Each structure stands twice: as C-alpha cells, then as structure tokens.
Amino acid sequence: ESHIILLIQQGSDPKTRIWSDHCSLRSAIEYIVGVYQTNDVSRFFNFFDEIYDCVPLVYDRHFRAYIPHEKQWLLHHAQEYLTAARKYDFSRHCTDYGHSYEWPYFRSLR
Amino acid sequence: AESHIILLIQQGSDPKTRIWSDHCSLRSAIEYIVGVYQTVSRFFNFFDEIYDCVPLVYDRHFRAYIPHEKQWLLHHAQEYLTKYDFSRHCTDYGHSYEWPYFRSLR
C-alpha cells in the first residue's frame, strides 16, 4: 500500500502544472528520470533543479493521509538510486493506476 | 493562515490532461472550479465529465493532506450555488514555499 504523488510545476507559470502518482518510491524515481530521457547524472540534476516546483506527497497507511516533503527529499532518494545502478514529456509513465479508484486509500473504503 | 486545499484534476481518460490546483480556503477552491466551468443544470454534467478529481485538504496539526472523493467537492459546490481552461485562477500562491506546511517549519 505505497502511493506517492508528485505535484510538478515546470515553469513559473502555473499553466505548466502536472501531477504524477506511483505505487513505490522506485517508480517515482524511474518516472522523473524517464522524463529527462525523453530528449549524464549531473545534467539530470540540472534538469531537476530547473523544475520550478515539485513537492512529493507520500501516503501513510495508518493515518490514511499524504505527507508533504520538500523538493530536496526526492533529490536524495534519486541520488542513491543512480549510484546502485553502477522538449521534455512529463506524461511519460506519469501514473501506475488508471483512476484514483485504484489508490490504496480508496480501496480501503470497501 | 493555515488552510490549504489541493485539487488533483484529470480532465479526460488520457493522463496528459492532468493538472492540479491549490487554494487557501474551501471557498477559493469552489470559486475556481466554477470559474473554469464558465470559460446551471449543465454544471452537474461538466463536473461529472471530469474523469478524476481528488481534493486534498490540509490538516494543520497532523501536517498532512486528507484525500476526499470527488463528490465531497460537488456537495460543497452545491451549497455555494444556493474548451475548458483549468488554469484560470488555479493557484492562490506563487510557489509551494508559501504553503502553510512549508511556512510551519520556519
């Protein structure tokens, strides 16, 4: 029952907003990396830092609520993900579910 | 203040139509979702055509967002009343730096 939502805003204009939901932290990291690869590591963190706003929300099983984190929180996890391995399109793999009907919170209400 | 509401919106079946709005009060979220409709029995059909809408309501103590079903925003929009540009007034802030949670840890 892991669920992570990324509130992404590409530029200073809120018109560029898009959100992604994933079933695990690895899926969230693989998503944002796959977004950068729609066109190096250090150049990737250049791309990540250029994102105007990106606040992750992680779901808590017991409290049944989403914990907000800073943009730096996803930086640290993405950093250690890339160590163990050895126009941008933000809709690429931007969801592991078809509808919020499938999210862990809404399934528990049945 | 410490009141924040996030609307996770997906217009069509394709997740490319995803957009999220954040507001400082429940009234602002309702006024926003009404403002996008006008860009009144047809308002029900507009809101029902939205493929997915998850309101996230912030709790000041627990410092977490409470997920709600789409009907929770519909019912509050109904009380307020007694193609579409979902970017119109879609934020009461300029950055999440101004949100109540991120102001709380200062």
Numbering used by the authors:
A (entry chain B): 7 to 45, 55 to 101, 121 to 144
B (entry chain A): 6 to 44, 56 to 98, 121 to 144
What text does the study give?
Recent work has revealed that Mmi1 interacts with Erh1 to form a complex, called EMC14, and loss of Mmi1 affects recruitment of Erh1 and its associated RNA processing activities to target transcripts. Here, we present the co-crystal structure of Erh1 in complex with the amino-terminal domain of Mmi1. Our structure reveals that Mmi1 binds homodimers of Erh1 in a 2:2 stoichiometry, via a conserved molecular interface characteristic of ERH family proteins. Structure-guided mutational analysis shows that the Mmi1-Erh1 interaction is essential for facultative heterochromatin assembly and for silencing of gametogenic genes.
We used a (Gly-Ser-Ser)5 linker to fuse Erh1 and Mmi195–122 in tandem. The co-crystal structure was resolved to 2.7 Å resolution by molecular replacement. Consistent with the 2:2 stoichiometry model based on the results from the SEC experiments, the co-crystal structure revealed that Erh1 forms a homodimer, with two Mmi1 subunits bound on the surface of the Erh1 homodimer. Overall, the Erh1 monomer adopted a typical ERH fold, characterized by a four-stranded antiparallel β-sheet (β1–β4) and three α-helixes (α1–α3), with the α-helixes on one face of the sheet. The outside faces of the β-sheets of two monomers constituted the homodimer interface and formed a pseudo-β-barrel, burying about 1000 Å2 of solvent-exposed area. Each Mmi1 peptide was bound across the β2 edge of the β-sheet of each Erh1 monomer, with the amino-terminal residues (Mmi1Lys96-Mmi1Cys103) located in the groove between α-helix α1 and the β-sheet, whereas the carboxy-terminal residues (Mmi1Thr104-Mmi1Arg119) were bound to the hydrophobic core of the dimer pseudo-β-barrel. When bound to Erh1, the carboxy-terminal residues of the Mmi195–122 peptide (109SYEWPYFRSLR119) folded into two consecutive helices, consisting of a 310 helix (H1) and an α-helix (H2). The Mmi1Trp112 aromatic ring stretched into a deep hydrophobic pocket formed by Erh1His9, Erh1Val70, Erh1Ile11, Erh1Leu13, and Erh1Trp25, with its Nε nitrogen forming a hydrogen bond with the side chain of Erh1Asp27. Indeed, Mmi1Trp112 is crucial for EMC formation as substitution with alanine disrupted Mmi1-Erh1 interaction as confirmed by GST pull-down assay and ITC. We also observed that the H1 helix toward the amino-terminus, Mmi1 (96KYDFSRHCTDYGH108), adopted a long structural loop conformation featuring several turns, which was constrained by an intertwined network of both intra- and inter-molecular interactions.
